[PDB]
Design a protein around this ligand. Structure first.
Ligand SMILES: OC[C@H]1O[C@@H](O[C@@H]2[C@@H](O)[C@H](O)O[C@H](CO)[C@H]2O)[C@H](O)[C@@H](O)[C@@H]1O
Ligand SMILES: [Ca+2]
Length: 769
């Protein structure tokens, strides 16, 4: 490996061998069908709300999130980079697809597949990823840096449906070598959203944009139809000329054939036919190819950028609504703008690299923090783009000031912005994209007093329940299968209108969002204040026994939705205390004296009784009325965790909080698989995992990272990082279960998982508060 020195990969990048087989991979531990796309994954490409594309460590474009809210794992084999090399003096060169695999049928059989093992590495530090190619049959060593411009405090480039591939080629040998790099792409119009005639009308055109010191050559792969529909738009691939390279192209090769129309050209001398051909296809799949060829002398390095864009302006949800995607603000809505997007990237990618470096540098340069922590901190952010992210710029046929946003809970449980989850998972948004975060919370504010008295069948018990109760915060803002933003509470497995954590978590999120954006946004507090008061006032009505605290009902009625709480719980109780303290402080800021007094009175009563009911001398009991009420819950003081972040002070005595956190580390972490797998949710006081429900026996990745942040704030530095380390290890390490770029909600002691690609572990960003 002589190429690594010619590029700049951070030491904290996650690494794996190209073509590496992973032997320890976990699988779902549930009885019901659940997504398992295996461990062949990579960091995604694409902006927020753009649709994303997962290019895996083996090189394939395989995890398709272009249909917003859907996960489709299938390798489109025509989409590749390939290389040709010929040593000066030799009669023949070699050509190789840079993909560690081969197609499953006979399409593209002429191409040279099966990039060999032990011949290159993949690296990722989101939003960047890299491949290096160090192959005994390729004398010139190559590397590529690929990324999209995901940039904190930037709502423009961060939305773009674009990727850059910055190639570096170096000749360490003593002979001249001719080298070509070729990007192939299938015209994927009709891959989704089209009910018949999936390739019909697809056609490819070549754009040559020549100006002074700028030559771009690109293929635009579109359809003859000018219809404005979810399926229609354009893909583009292209390259920018640099000194010492020549560009060649082929407009049209058949992807549903053996590929020799292209490969007989590329494999001879790495130079394509430059054949334009705008003939639309009928049934055949078609694709385009863009190549560069250059001669490298001994010791010479060359850099050359390629790009990919996709202009698919319309997202459609299963309930029928069609929306424009956010990036259309910057490029237009007609779906004929892929070249403009590509050109912007090829002319500005160096600026974008610097902008990414500028935001990663404060963390990467901090030599007090271990590299593993940096690996997880940046790579968990993959989910912000890869979580079915929807970001609208108008309803089709509709202008408003704001752009509504939603991130999925996950794909298995297809609900936008699930609030009990976003309490943990929204840290990156408030910290890095706060205008999105505040927009989401206004979306929730607007739902508080919505009443939908139409009844739905509850999945878990078959009862009928009201869809949405006035004054109760919704579980979610809809499903991609139905109507995001319009029809809330798509979750129907249980009735969220009786949950005891949603209304408190809502208030805590509101005040968090004020505090972590500098305590200056009084307008945001004003917008949300009525909803805050309503939410707490409704929750107060659920106090059955007048101890000042809402009663859990002995059926799951909170985020641990199979782990029943009854009476006063540490979890819902502490969240309630913190929410009351938050509302007092908002009352003070907004000069609402009567609200301040009321919530102060409720707080003092509830605080006294919480302590009396639950403090046992070592930790806070799980609850007051359950069969294993004395279980040690990892998340028992979630309200105090948030109170620390919100600078609300002590809701419980410092001594008791410290004792409780030490007990959780000693038991839920260190007595669970030697503290190498995170914090198990429930442990009995005898040091045996609580078996009352599956959730008690799970580690929740997002709960564990949040607990680590709580420990860190409380000065338990070693315990914090040791607790988080087990989550990192399981997700990323060779000794773990292969969950990189699909971090799950949960695992059990055997390492098997529930709900890959989950929002909650974005809570790792609470460790950066
Ligand atoms: O892991 C806890 C989270 O569980 C989620 O519930 C899932 C449902 O959404 C899905 O429809 O069904 C499965 C199987 O019954 C549930 O696990 C909730 O959406 C989250 O609120 C909850 O925290
Ligand atoms: Ca009560």
């Amino acid at each position: 490996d002589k190429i690594s020195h010619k590029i700049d990969i951070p030491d904290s990048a996650w690494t794996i061998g190209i073509g590496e087989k992973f032997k320890n991979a976990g699988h779902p531990n549930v009885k019901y069908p659940m997504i398992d796309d295996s461990y062949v994954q990579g960091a995604p490409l694409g902006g927020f709300g753009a649709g994303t594309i997962g290019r895996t460590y083996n090189g394939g474009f395989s995890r398709w999130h272009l249909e917003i809210g859907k996960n489709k794992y299938t390798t489109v084999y025509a989409n590749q980079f390939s290389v040709f090399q010929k040593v000066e003096g030799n009669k023949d060169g070699v050509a190789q697809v840079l993909y560690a695999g081969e197609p499953e049928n006979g399409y593209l059989s002429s191409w040279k597949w099966d990039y060999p093992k032990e011949s290159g590495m993949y690296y990722a530090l989101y939003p960047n990823s890299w491949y290096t190619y160090t192959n005994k049959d390729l004398p010139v060593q190559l590397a590529v840096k690929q990324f999209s411009p995901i940039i904190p405090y930037n709502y423009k480039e961060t939305s773009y449906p674009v990727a850059v591939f910055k190639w570096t080629a170096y000749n360490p040998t003593n002979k001249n070598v001719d080298v070509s790099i070729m990007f192939t792409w299938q015209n994927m119009i009709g891959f989704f959203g089209k009910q018949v005639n999936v390739n019909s009308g697809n056609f490819n055109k070549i754009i040559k944009d020549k100006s002074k010191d700028s030559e771009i050559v690109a293929a635009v792969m579109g359809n003859i139809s000018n219809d404005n529909e979810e399926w229609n738009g354009e893909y583009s691939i292209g390259v920018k000329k640099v000194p010492g390279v020549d560009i060649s192209y082929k407009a049209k090769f058949v992807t549903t054939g053996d590929g020799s129309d292209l490969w007989h050209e590329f494999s001879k001398n790495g130079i394509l036919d430059n054949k334009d051909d705008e003939t639309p296809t009928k049934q055949d799949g078609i694709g385009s190819a863009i190549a560069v060829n250059f001669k490298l002398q001994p010791g010479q390095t060359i850099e050359v950028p390629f790009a990919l864009s996709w202009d698919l302006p319309i997202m459609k949800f299963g309930g029928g609504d069609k929306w424009y995607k956010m990036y259309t603000k910057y490029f237009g809505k007609n779906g004929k703008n892929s070249f403009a997007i590509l050109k912007e990237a090829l002319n500005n990618y160096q600026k974008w690299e610097k902008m990414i470096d500028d935001w990663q540098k404060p963390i990467l340069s901090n030599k007090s923090k271990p590299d593993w922590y940096k690996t997880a901190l940046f790579n968990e952010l993959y989910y912000l783009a890869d979580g079915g992210t929807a970001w609208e710029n108008g309803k089709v046929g509709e202008k408003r000031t704001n752009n509504m946003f939603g991130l999925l809970e996950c794909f298995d449980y297809n609900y936008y912005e699930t609030l009990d989850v976003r309490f943990y998972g929204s840290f990156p948004l408030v910290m890095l994209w706060p205008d999105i975060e505040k927009q989401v919370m206004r979306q929730f504010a607007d739902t508080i007093n919505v009443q939908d008295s139409s009844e739905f069948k509850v999945g878990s018990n078959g009862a009928m329940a009201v869809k949405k109760v006035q004054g109760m915060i919704p579980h979610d803002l809809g499903s991609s299968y139905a109507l995001p933003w319009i029809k809330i509470n798509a979750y129907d497995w249980q009735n969220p209108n009786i949950w005891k954590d949603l209304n408190s978590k809502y208030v805590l999120l509101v005040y968090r969002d004020y505090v972590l954006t500098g305590k200056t946004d009084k307008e945001f507090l004003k917008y949300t204040w009525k909803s805050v008061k309503t939410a707490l006032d409704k929750l107060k009505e659920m106090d059955k026994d007048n101890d000042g605290i809402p009663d859990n009902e002995g059926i799951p009625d909170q985020t641990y939705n199979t782990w029943s709480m009854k009476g006063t719980s540490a979890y819902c109780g502490s969240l309630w205390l913190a929410a009351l303290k938050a509302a007092q402080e908002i009352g003070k800021v907004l000069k609402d004296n009567e609200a301040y007094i009321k919530y102060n009175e409720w707080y003092k009563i509830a605080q006294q009784n919480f302590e009396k009911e639950l403090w046992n001398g070592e930790y806070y009991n799980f609850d007051t009325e359950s069969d294993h009420k004395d279980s040690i819950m990892a998340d028992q003081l979630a309200g105090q965790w948030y109170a620390d972040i919100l600078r609300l002070g002590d809701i419980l005595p410092k001594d008791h909080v410290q004792k409780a956190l030490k007990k959780i580390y000693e038991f839920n972490v260190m007595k669970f698989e030697n503290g190498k797998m995170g914090a198990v949710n429930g442990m009995r006081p005898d040091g045996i995992v609580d078996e009352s429900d599956i959730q008690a026996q799970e580690v929740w990745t997002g709960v564990t990272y949040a607990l680590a942040s709580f420990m860190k704030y409380r000065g338990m530095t070693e315990e914090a990082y040791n607790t988080a380390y087990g989550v990192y290890k399981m997700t990323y390490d060779k000794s773990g279960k292969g969950y990189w770029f699909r971090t799950p909600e949960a695992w059990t002691k055997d390492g098997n998982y529930r709900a890959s690609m989950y929002m909650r572990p974005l809570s790792i960003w609470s460790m950066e508060v």
